[PDB]
Write an enzyme that holds these catalytic residues in place. Structure first.
Site, mmCIF file in Angstrom:
data_model
loop_
_atom_site.group_PDB
_atom_site.id
_atom_site.type_symbol
_atom_site.label_atom_id
_atom_site.label_comp_id
_atom_site.label_asym_id
_atom_site.label_seq_id
_atom_site.Cartn_x
_atom_site.Cartn_y
_atom_site.Cartn_z
ATOM 1 N N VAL A 22 0.488 -0.934 0.084
ATOM 2 C CA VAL A 22 0.461 -0.118 0.123
ATOM 3 C C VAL A 22 1.063 1.372 -0.284
ATOM 4 O O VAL A 22 1.854 1.318 0.559
ATOM 5 C CB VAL A 22 -1.154 -0.162 1.295
ATOM 6 N N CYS A 23 0.010 2.565 -0.635
ATOM 7 C CA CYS A 23 1.149 3.315 -0.514
ATOM 8 C C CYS A 23 1.160 4.135 0.095
ATOM 9 O O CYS A 23 -0.091 3.784 1.333
ATOM 10 C CB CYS A 23 0.976 4.233 -2.074
ATOM 11 N N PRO A 24 2.354 4.323 1.153
ATOM 12 C CA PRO A 24 2.135 5.003 2.139
ATOM 13 C C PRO A 24 2.164 6.419 2.694
ATOM 14 O O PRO A 24 2.657 7.267 3.910
ATOM 15 C CB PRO A 24 4.082 5.348 2.835
ATOM 16 N N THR A 25 0.995 7.250 2.580
ATOM 17 C CA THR A 25 0.512 8.474 2.679
ATOM 18 C C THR A 25 0.400 8.453 3.820
ATOM 19 O O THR A 25 0.792 9.841 4.492
ATOM 20 C CB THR A 25 -1.338 8.925 1.701
#
Ligand SMILES: [K+]
Ligand SMILES: [K+]
Ligand SMILES: [K+]
Ligand SMILES: [K+]
Ligand SMILES: [K+]
Ligand SMILES: [K+]
Ligand SMILES: [K+]
Ligand SMILES: [K+]
EC number: 1.11.1.26
Lengths: 162, 162, 162, 162, 162, 163, 163, 162, 163, 163
Positions: free
Chosen positions: I45-48
């Site tokens: 998952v992208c860590p935004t």
């Protein structure tokens, strides 16, 4: 107290008129039974109590009432005793030996410190029910006449409910 | 088994030479003690297993060994017995009465289902440590001859280690 | 049995001679006390047992014997019962009420399914040791004369050990 | 004690006459069996307690008795031992190895603090009921002569009751 | 696993260079210790493993590393074995006997079914910490050279923390 | 409280108009019952609570309500009390004897240190559900009339759900 | 029953005379207290009971009796209830909010499946001893007059042991 | 030890050749599996241990041996680690992630105070029986060559019993 | 929920701007702390969420707020992730490693069947009292700005009791 | 946390649009539900939260999201509250009364020492799975906008696995 409770099963060796027999709870069924516990054979207490009962044994048998003396001594031991003191020789009823203490404890009558039975008498009816109990300390004697009185009265109420 | 254990404490009545004494674990004393257990007094095997031990008793003080016969009968019962069998009359050692069975069970020697002690003999040294054990079913007699065996030099190993 | 045990503590209210008083084990200390249990007041079984004991009360008081009758009824009921039956009116000893059944359960004398005491008698010495017990099913009367016998007997032994 | 009990089941390795077999409770079989326990192989008392038993082994099949020596060493260890002492070389009976101590503890014969068996000998009859027991501390040897004693007529009583 | 745990106290008899000694956990304190467990002496497995270790014993002693062979056999038994197979004769390190199995179980290395130790090697540091463990099934041999390699590396990290 | 619970089973001996009866929960099914507890018979307190109930008994019987007075005395004792007293002779409802205390204990109403019941009253509907409970210390009498009121209400709500 | 017991300790919020206050057991000591439980505010299964009690309130007050109404609602809900109904608006004694149900459970007066207290009334004397309990199912109203009676009776016996 | 026991069930995710796969005990059934535990990915201790095993992977695959590396890191971390260290990039065997530590606890190989696996290696045969265990503190490397030796050895014994 | 409770003691290794640190509850005393949990480093998952927090970190540090990101990976793993990633390289707050799960478990925040933490955020005051908790399933990002708002409020109420 | 769990079963009374209704877990199935807990009605620690949610209510409604407010007050108290405040008067979603605290304990959201629920919001998807949780101390308001966001986000991820 154990009054009005059913005696529990047992199996002991006993001595009755020159021979060794076995008594169990079945043998007491259908009969009136008197269990006469005492602490020990060959003691220096005068055995008058066991003998006093002997005196009423004919009338007890006549009323359909069986008798059993009991001690933690062996049945072998009751014999020696029966054939040694003239008073003890009057016994024609079974002399049960309870060296395991099982019978004595069934009636919750053990002097647990001494391994001997307390001086207690029990009247058991044909159904195995305890109907009269008497226990006394060393030295207080049991008068067989009173036992007999309770017994006839006991037998009576079974027959005349009121 | 109890081989090599320290005996546990006890207080029983016993009979010795015409009148009645007490035995405790301390009366064993810095002496060699022999606990000779047997089932019961007055039975019909004549037991001079006990008598052989009596015969050899004089020689048993030998060494400073006391001999104690033990059954679940009472001391009252043992005397009566010393007076009925001439062979039993031979006994000069203590006949301990163990009605509660505590002495017998101390030596883990009770026939729990009979309330009698098993035919076991135990040899105890002066600090009360059991050095020898022999147990047999009834009908298999124990010979005092070498019950005497060998106390031994149990003596020796103890006074000449190894 | 409870034979030879020391009675347990209790604090109960009672009817004794026209007055309500409280009774505790302490009021028994130093005296011979007789604890006479019965099922219930106002029942239709005749209190011939209680009156017979009263007749001998003059006489129990001589030996330094206290008498306590006990039922699970209240002291209030005892006051009432003492005024209705002429046989009961004779009672000069304490009628203990044990509504909680605790005193009754102390002598293990409760018929739990009924909430009433068994017909039991106990003789307790000045040190609080129960020396005699007599228990019977209903219809099997307790003989007061015989009670007296046991008590005198109980007293001798106590002043002349064996 | 274990006098008169049925032996419990076991499976141990043992050595007999040049190569290795299994012993189970069933190999005891309808025979008289002798379990000869000893502390350990290769110690320095030379043990022909074991050898005497070997000497008398021929006569021990006598009666259809098997002799089993038992120690907590392995069977591997017992053979090595049969080859080092000429006196031990004399053994023709089974030397059971009991590394887990289960056989030893079955006979309640373990010196729990050492992991070795005590000097105990047991005689087992054909249904596996123990008829004789002898246990001694080390330094007190057992004589096979009357280990042979008396298997007896243990024989007899068993084939001529009483 | 027991990696990084402290060995627990023990006391066994062991055999080291013609004599019988006692090893306890104190003796391992301040030293590097190698406990080399094996199932049993006198087995038909070629003892190469115990001997292979003997070969490195001089270098092990040089590094301050003590060695202990262990079996549930007695120490008496290790001796016979040391003086019987030429390979076993190379051992100059202590050969511990653990007939109680206590040591072997301390290291959780018992084949509970067989009463013998598993083929396991343990490296213990001066503080009593287990730093390397190796266990293998029957037939998988331990190569002493690798043990030594682990040991120098083990000793190194104690000295060069990084 | 025991409010809105089903009474538990019981079997007791009782006195009712000169005769001995057995009373059990089964004897309550289908009826409205009032279990009227009091400490003991023959005490020194005047029995107006039991008598007051008797005075309204007739009327309660019309409403189909049974009355059980209850103390831990025996039925034998109730017999005696019913004859000896004034006001209690007025009692025609069942006097339950509870020497074992189970009935009393059923209603959580035992003075355990005394072996007697508290001065407590319970109204129970035909399904054995307690609809009203009233308990007081000695000296605070229970008013039979207020009992009736409550009972009427109990019967009403019960015959006309949701108001 | 809880009859003849001392109340257990409590600390609750309440609505009193236009104001919010704290009430604790220490606040009942030395006084006669009436704990009047009810299911809930804003039901309108009749709030006659709270209002009725309000009407007899100073007669209760200068027999020296305090009145505390209790429901599992908050005190907040009580002021609100006090502002909507002319009948509730009449209440000048303290309305205790028992959101945690602790007071209610203290008097063992909680309907667990509903989360509300039962129609129970308790009379507590200056020593904190419960001398009277009255519990009823919904629909069976509690009579204020009978309460008053009981309280006077309670007070008498309490000041004149033996009558 | 876990020696000779059958491994317990597990279902874990892993990185093997560029792909995420799931691994269970079932994927090991019928094969020889080597379970290689290590403390953690991305640590600064060099994975020379892991790469050395990879170098011999070509070779483990020949014997029908599967290799599973295990750490409490995720498979995700393993994907990452496999791409950062060239030594790690060589891993063609499965890198099992055991974030729950359950697989690690299965082999009783957890350092509970750290939440990481010990440096432990296990050889498991096709029937799921652990035949070899090697565990070390950090700094004490496991030799891959020696691992191979044990496995070949493990395989012989398995095809040529004793 | 854990709302209004004191955080429990913990000792973890962590990554903070290139160095390894130890973090314990004692390190939180006297400060406002945000414990920011996430499942794992290096996932797909992208860590935004972590990065969004970093973006507001400066501003949080002005308000005196500490940030601890937390996953059950080791600090070693955080090191790696902090270098390898885009957005995570932006992280200057402490990255706590919780391989034993005790920190995660302290906050009841463990996915036990996974051995990973839930996507959960906690705001803790200087006395160690949790004032706000926010938890979401994957795909439902946590907004750092809303976190700040809550924190401001938390600080306000805390510096201006009763409104 | 209860994150990613299925709600447990419940049967409660509620106020809805001028009417009283029953709400059960079966009533949430197939829909997105927002469970909005609050301490109590008639506090006036700001009721902005209930009203704010009311304002975003049909936006929530035709994302297909149901809103249930929950407090430990009764439904009765809720209608009353709904009739006094123009802000509360604006609520057209269901106001659940939880006097027993069972719903509140279901969401493990009860303040045991107060008997009221915490300021907690929960988002439940059609499968009854909690996808979002927000809990705050008094004074730390809950943002409706952020809720809406989360819900849309929740719905997306749920209809588009992998983005
Ligand atoms: K006896
Ligand atoms: K009574
Ligand atoms: K051994
Ligand atoms: K009717
Ligand atoms: K409420
Ligand atoms: K982890
Ligand atoms: K600040
Ligand atoms: K409430």
């Amino acid at each position: 107290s154990l009054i009005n409770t059913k005696i529990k099963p047992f199996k002991n060796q006993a001595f009755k008129n020159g021979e060794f027999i076995e008594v169990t709870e079945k043998d007491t069924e259908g009969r009136w039974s008197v269990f006469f516990f005492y602490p020990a054979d060959f003691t220096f207490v005068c055995p008058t109590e066991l003998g006093d009962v002997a005196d009423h044994y004919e009338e007890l048998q006549k009323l359909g009432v069986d008798v059993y003396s009991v001690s933690t001594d062996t049945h072998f031991t009751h014999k020696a005793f029966h054939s040694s003191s003239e008073t003890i020789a009057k016994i024609k009823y079974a002399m049960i030996g309870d060296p395991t203490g099982a019978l004595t404890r069934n009636f919750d009558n053990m002097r647990e410190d001494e391994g001997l039975a307390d001086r207690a008498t029990f009247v058991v009816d044909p159904q195995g029910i305890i109907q009269a109990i008497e226990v006394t300390a060393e030295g207080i004697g049991r008068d067989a006449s009173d036992l007999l009185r309770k017994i006839k009265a006991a037998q009576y109420v079974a027959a005349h409910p009121g």
